[PDB]
Amino acid sequence: SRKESYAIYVYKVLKQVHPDTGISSKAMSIMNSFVNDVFERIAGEASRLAHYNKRSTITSREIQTAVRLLLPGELAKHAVSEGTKAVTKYTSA
Amino acid sequence: TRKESYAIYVYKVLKQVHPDTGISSKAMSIMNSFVNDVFERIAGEASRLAHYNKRSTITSREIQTAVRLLLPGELAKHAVSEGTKAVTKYTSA
Amino acid sequence: RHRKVLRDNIQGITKPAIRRLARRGGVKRISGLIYEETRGVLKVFLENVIRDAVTYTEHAKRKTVTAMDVVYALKRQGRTLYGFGG
Amino acid sequence: AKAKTRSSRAGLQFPVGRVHRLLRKGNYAERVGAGAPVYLAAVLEYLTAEILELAGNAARDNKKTRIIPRHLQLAVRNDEELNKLLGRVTIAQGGVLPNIQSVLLPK
Amino acid sequence: HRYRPGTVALREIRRYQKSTELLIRKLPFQRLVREIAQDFKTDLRFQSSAVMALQEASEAYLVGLFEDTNLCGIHAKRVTIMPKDIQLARRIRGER
Amino acid sequence: ANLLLQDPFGVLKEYPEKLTHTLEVPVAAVCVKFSPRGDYLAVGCSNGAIIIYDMDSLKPIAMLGTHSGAHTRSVQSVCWSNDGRYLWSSGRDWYAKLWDMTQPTKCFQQYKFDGPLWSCHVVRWNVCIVTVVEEPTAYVLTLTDRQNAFHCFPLLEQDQDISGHGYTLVACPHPTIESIIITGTSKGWINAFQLDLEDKIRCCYEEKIANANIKQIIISPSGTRIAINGSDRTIRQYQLIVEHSVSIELEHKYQDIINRLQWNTIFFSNHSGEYLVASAHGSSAHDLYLWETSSGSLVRVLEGADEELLDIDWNFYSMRIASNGFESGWVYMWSIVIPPKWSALAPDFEEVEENIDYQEKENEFDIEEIAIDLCTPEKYDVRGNDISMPSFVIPIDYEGVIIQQHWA
DNA sequence: ATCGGATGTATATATCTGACACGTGCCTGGAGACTAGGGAGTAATCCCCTTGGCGGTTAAAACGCGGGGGACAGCGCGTACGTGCGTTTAAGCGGTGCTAGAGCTGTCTACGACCAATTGAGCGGCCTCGGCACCGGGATTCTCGA
DNA sequence: TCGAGAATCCCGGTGCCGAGGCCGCTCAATTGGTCGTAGACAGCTCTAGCACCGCTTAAACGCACGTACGCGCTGTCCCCCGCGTTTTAACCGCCAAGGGGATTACTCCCTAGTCTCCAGGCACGTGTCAGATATATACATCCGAT
């Protein structure tokens, strides 16, 4: 049956930073199960911030504040600035 | 306006097992905060457990299998028997 | 009105107040170098809690670090605090 | 750049179609906003790019082309930020960081 | 009349383990919180029951560290804690 | 400018990217304005000082506000002349002091105002349009043949009402015409004002775009683009058609979709304004922004600071961005770095970025009167500026330099 | 073993106080009736993967030996932590003032849910080949008894 | 301070399969429409946090001192490492078999949604009672001297 994955989508980021290297199928299942874990910590935390404030919407502001809660130090500051760079390509174009 | 509590529903169970004994207002707020925390452990665990089997219903069967995970040991063997007593006495009556 | 850059309030966590926290832990003889080490470990614990405690308010668009938001900051680090709601 | 496949409108390589599905039938909140899967797919792009930069980086040191799981633990435990993010975790078949306590080293 | 080195301490322990008031004073601890919160915002306003929840959660952690400073300083066969004892108990627990 | 003739291979940027200085000024500031060259930074300080900085060693040369005319309250805005000779300084001590650096401590002519100010803008080096608070006209103050007659020229026609538009809060002159003054009301509307430099003025252009308090109006230095910063969350860049006769049209809208911040100050690029910057208002916004003014996308972010940045300045020679971090008070500064080159150790090295496969030639086994001119200066730099105007060098204080070992 | 104080600690009245258990009002959330409906149960197939067995081959464990060093007790030193006594210097307090911000109400505009109508990227399946396992010569080098 | 020894490193050749590249192919992504409602405004009331002051003294502060504990330095012996020889079960690669997981397909009954009702329980004002200080005291553990 159709069991989806993030298998091909990790592969298109490996062929951006290191365009000659490959990846094993065990170390694909780690990155397939890495992305499935940082999902449940970001949408898991930004389902409390949009519940403590009696909102009902995961906006794009909570995923900013979910990331500044989880990610430590200088990964927060770069991934926040990777976010608003990529939602503004979405809003204009 | 109004802030709900579990203040009175603790208070009947205090006078049930210790019928002369009062409680303070700071040590009510702990027992108010304790009930809210065993909720979001149990209903948290009985929600992921509904998701892992790809159901969409918290039935009584999940909360039997969420008490049996969090509650360590002899509290698990009691609060299962204190549950299925009270789900028969709701259904049959 | 008053722009006071507050510095060295860490020296108010006094040498006879780390002694009494030592006593409630139930320890007998304290070194001379504990008193400038516990303040190094107190200022690490308060930095992690208040940075989350501000973030919960800064998202909520207030200028008050209310006691629901300190309790939520402690709950995220796995040190739940019963006594102020949740 | 394009019109179809919202990721290409955003300029990501992670799908914003799948992430917007997995914020509704995962039941995280009632009504997920339209900007929300865009921001989340960009962060999951960046953390996958940050690992696979450092993974193949220590793939080059080993001198092998492809990445085995042993290279992933060497990319995670050698980096402090990643280490903090992946503190609890165990990467399967991944070895440990090579260190000896230096009291045990000889004279 | 200069009772013995050590047994004022065991009279000091049994007083403090049987009592439950807050040990760090209120006003120096309230200026420590308003010093550390200057880095993360400027002109904050702490609601005055959230400088109790930062006290009774912080000195219930410092006490819980000295219970694990003492178990490893007994382990080195002495009764004197030291800063090479604290940084074991933070490292084994996983604060580093 | 000969350092940029030798620095690159020939590629030089069009915005700074990194931030390499920081003026340790502990008393805070309000406005930072450079000279018309990159040498001198006028700093509008918070208590009422002006601590003018030489931009080569990060330590000052003067202080306007020693002999006569020191600002008691805060100083709000400042501009410079065409050559950098004078200073026109607007403050909250109800005083607009035209300073001159020939006497680098004394004012020349002041005006006791009816209240505080917001901004100042010069058209010529003497005449200066000021924004008197709670006034629906702009009493532009001109230094005439006598200094005393500050003609409070009301920038409004005698019949025209901006009743329902509030007061005028911004006035910025046109670069290329030098006689039509664009002003923006406190509620929405934008006027034009053609000063005859007699005192006839024509309200050629009036309109309303959106109901907000217009904090700032800038014009691009080619006179093409004009950006408007409201009190709501938008930046409307417009295109300017002046042959007088004026009409604008909407080019682009720049917003922060995530946090919805207010934009404090905005500033344009050098030649035709191909890049728009801004500084946001709310806390945790720690960075100036950039925008490609045609496409509209967020293209780069000046991620150097730790605080919220209030004012801004872009001098085009040194390509710097000066900005006071409002919380601490320190002037953050960005600069185009130039990495060093070992290619200038000997007259023939080469820095190739890759292992080149040089082909093997035959040679490896074998064993004037041009025209000379000395008189003209330079005419155009690598940036392509108005250069060959030898600027007004600010003289250092040669009245009391001997004292400066003893007691300031 | 045990004296002599002895001194703080735990064991009894006093009695005031402001925390709490209690009595009225009300209001909004809970309870029932019932409706359509889809999600779960309950059959059914079917075939994939686990349990079992075995016949090898042999890496690996199990065992025993010597010898070496690391643990552990002992002792002595010296230093620094405790004890207290005497003395400052804020903490606590209560009190009044003040106001900046929190909370709520109410308008009202943007916007996410949802529907269908279309389709094209993504998963599954299939071929294929090169990256790494897998061993051999030698060169270094890494220790240790010379 | 080192020459014999041996484990590692390293570089090589030859082989394997599993990573990668496509071929078709369906369902999930897109979108382009409605639709109300959640959140975004200003606005207003108010209360709770902050600033301050006078006081009262409890607690920090400093110093002096003597004492016990850390530390270091011994010697001892025991027990852990090292290694050879024998032993045994892990492993791999077979076999085969069938249980159970996975899907499909009807079917039905539980519940979501809506409405109609009403009292549970919320906040408030109430007296009152179990406290905690305020106070002398009987005796447990502690201590210098015997």
Question: Does residue C68 contact residue B36 with C-beta atoms inside 8 Å?
Answer: no
Chain C closest-CA separation from residue B36 CA (Å): 6
Residue F394's region, left for phi above 0, alpha for psi from -120 to 50, else beta, is beta
* Strands F96-100 and F86-91, bridge-based pairing: antiparallel
CB D14 within 8 A of CB A86: no
Query: Beta carbon of D20 within 7 Å of strand H?
Result: yes
What separation, in Å, do the N-terminal and C-terminal C-alpha atoms of chain C show? Answer: 37
Which residues does chain B have within 8 Å of residue C82's beta carbon, measured at their own beta carbons? 30, 33-34, 37
Least CA distance to E42: which residue of chain F? F327
DSSP letter at C34 equals S
Looking up tokens 């509290």 gives: B75
- Token duo for residue D51: 């690992």
Helix and strand counts by DSSP (H, E) for chain F: 1, 26
Contact (CB, 8 A) for F197 and F153: no
**Which residue from A minimizes the CA distance to F252?**
A92
List all residues of chain E from 40 to 79 with a beta carbon under 8 Å from chain C: 40-41, 43-47, 49-50, 52-54, 56-59, 61-67, 69-70, 73, 79
- C-alpha F293/C-alpha F271 separation (Å) is 13
D37: Cβ contacts below 8 Å, ≥ 6 apart: D16, D19, D20, D23
Where on the phi/psi map is residue F214: left (φ > 0), alpha (ψ -120 to 50), or beta? beta
C-alpha of D57 from chain center: 14
Distance between CA atoms of residues F189 and F183, nearest Å = 9
Put simply, the answer to whether B29 touches C80 (Cβ < 8 Å) is no
Concatenating the DSSP letter of every residue in A17-70 gives HSTT--B-SHHHHHHHHHHHHHHHHHHHHTTTHHHHTS-----TTHHHHHHHHH
Whether the CB of B54 is below 8 Å from some CB of chain D: the reply is: no
Q: Is the CB of B16 under 7 A from strand G?
A: no
Closest residue to G124 (CA to C1') is: A2
Q: What is the C-alpha to C-alpha distance for residues C5 and E42, in angstroms, rounded to an integer?
A: 10
Q: Taking the C1' atom of G84, which residue's CA lies nearest? A: E2
3-state SS, one letter per residue, for D39-64: HHHHHHHHHHHHHHHHHHHHHHCCCC
DSSP character for B40?
H
Dihedral over Cα of B72, B74, B76, B82: its sign: negative
Q: Any chain F CB within 8 A of the CB of D26?
A: no
Domains of chain C in sequence order = 1-86 (1.10.20.10)
The whole-angstrom separation of Cα A1 and Cα D61 is: 40
Contacting chains of C (3 CB pairs or more, <8 Å) are A, B, E
The dihedrals phi and psi of C47, each to the nearest 5 degrees, come to -70, -35
d(CA B89, CA F8) in angstroms, rounded, equals 86
**Spatial distance between the Cα atoms of A58 and D20, rounded to a whole number of angstroms:** 11
Task: Say what angle helices A26-45 and D36-60 make with each other, to 10 degrees.
Answer: 150
Q: What CATH number corresponds to the domain at position D4?
A: 1.10.20.10
Asked if E36 contacts C50 with a C-beta cutoff of 8 angstroms, the reply is yes
Tell me the residue type at F146: R
Protein-covered nucleotides on strand G (Cβ within 7 A) = 8-10, 19-21, 28, 39-41, 80-85, 90-93, 100-105, 111-113, 120-124, 131-133
DSSP 8-state symbol, F36: S
d(CA C49, CA F407): 48
Which residue, chain included where needed, has tokens 């995280």? D28
Which of E12, E88, E60, E77 is closest to C27 using CA atoms?
E12
| Pairing verdict, β E80-81 and C29-30 | parallel
Q: How many CB atoms lie within 10 A of CB F287?
A: 18
Cβ proximity of C35 and E16 under 8 Å: no
Three-class SS of residue B69? Answer: helix
Contact F262, F252 (CB under 8 A): no
Other C-beta atoms closer than 10 Å to the C-beta of F27 total 12
Q: Residue A80, Cβ neighbours under 10 Å: how many?
A: 22
Look up residue F364 and give its DSSP letter. Answer: G
46-85 on C, CB < 7 Å from strand H: 64
State the nucleotide closest to B24 in CA–C1' terms: G20
Q: Of residues 13 to 32 in chain C, which lie within 7 A of strand G by their beta carbon?
A: 28-32
Tell me if D82 sits within 8 A of A46, measured CB to CB: no
Q: Quick check: E45 CB within 7 A of strand G?
A: yes
DSSP character for F188? S
D6, D22, D36: residue with CB nearest A63: D36
Q: Domains in chain A, start-ordered, CATH in brackets? A: 1-93 (1.10.20.10)
In single-letter form, the type of residue at position D24 comes to: R
Q: What is the DSSP string of F257-284?
A: TTT-PPEEEEEE-SSS--EEEEEE-STT
Q: Which residues pair with F321 in a beta bridge?
A: F314, F334
Q: Is D26 an interface residue toward B (CB < 8 Å)?
A: yes
Q: In units of Å, what resolution does this entry have?
A: 3.7
Mutate to test the interface with A, among D28, D76, D91 (most CBs of A within 10 A): D28
Q: How far apart are CA E51 and CA C53, in angstroms?
A: 12
Nucleotide G38, nearest residue via CA and C1':
B56
Three-class secondary structure of residue F314 per DSSP: strand
C-alpha dihedral, F312 to F314 to F319 to F325, nearest 10°: -10
Residues present in chain B in total: 93
- What is the end-to-end Cα distance of chain E in Å, rounded? 46
Per-residue CA distances from F82 to E48, F180, F195 (Å): 57, 18, 19
Instruction: Return the percent helix, strand and coil in chain F, to nearest 5.
Output: 5, 35, 60
Cα–Cα distance, B3 to B9 (Å, whole number): 15
C-alpha distances out from residue F63 to F66, F220, F323, F397, Å: 7, 31, 19, 10
Contact between F18 and F337 (Cβ < 8 Å)? yes
The position carrying tokens 């509008």 is F44
For B63, the token pair is 């909360």
Structure tokens at D9: 């409108």
Residue B28 neighbours by CB under 8 Å, 6+ apart: B7, B10, B11
Q: Is the CB of D104 less than 7 A from some atom of nucleic acid strand G?
A: no
Give Cα E7 distance to the centre of its chain.
22
Which residues are CB-contacts of F103 (< 8 A; sequence separation ≥ 6)? Answer: F67
What's the farthest any 2 CA atoms get from each other in chain B? 49
Q: Does residue F330 contact residue F22 with C-beta atoms inside 8 Å?
A: yes
In 3D space, the residue among D54, D55, D26 whose CA is nearest the CA of residue D40 turns out to be D26
Q: Which two tokens stand for residue F190?
A: 């934008």
Cβ C46 vs Cβ C38: under 8 Å: no
- Cβ atoms < 10 Å from Cβ of F8: 14
Query: What is the number of structural domains in chain D?
Result: 1
CA of residue D96 to C1' of nucleotide H89, angstroms: 30
Q: What is the gyration radius of the CA atoms in chain F, in angstroms? A: 24
**Among chain B residues 33 through 72, which have CB within 7 angstroms of nucleic chain G?**
55-57, 59, 61
Residue where the block lists tokens 């609601």: E47
**Contact flag A87-F259 (C-beta cutoff 8 Å):** no
Distance from residue E30 (CA) to nucleotide H125 (C1'), in Å? 36
Q: How many CB atoms are closer than 10 A to CB E54?
A: 27
**Domains observed in chain E:** 1-96 (1.10.20.10)
Of the candidates C74, C41, C27, the residue with the CA atom closest to the CA atom of residue E68? C27
| Chain-chain contact of C50 with E10 (C-beta, under 8 angstroms) | no
Of F395, F407, F399, F400, residue with least CA distance to F39: F395
> CB pairs under 8 A, 24+ apart, for C13-21?
C13/C38, C13/C39, C13/C42, C13/E24, C13/E28, C13/E29, C13/E32, C14/E25, C14/E28, C17/E23, C17/E24, C17/E25, C18/E62, C20/E16, C20/E23, C21/E23, C21/E24, C21/E59, C21/E62, C21/E63, C21/E66
Beta bridge partners of F289: F278, F301
Task: Spell out which residues of chain D touch residue B51, defining contact as CB-CB under 8 Å.
Answer: 26-27
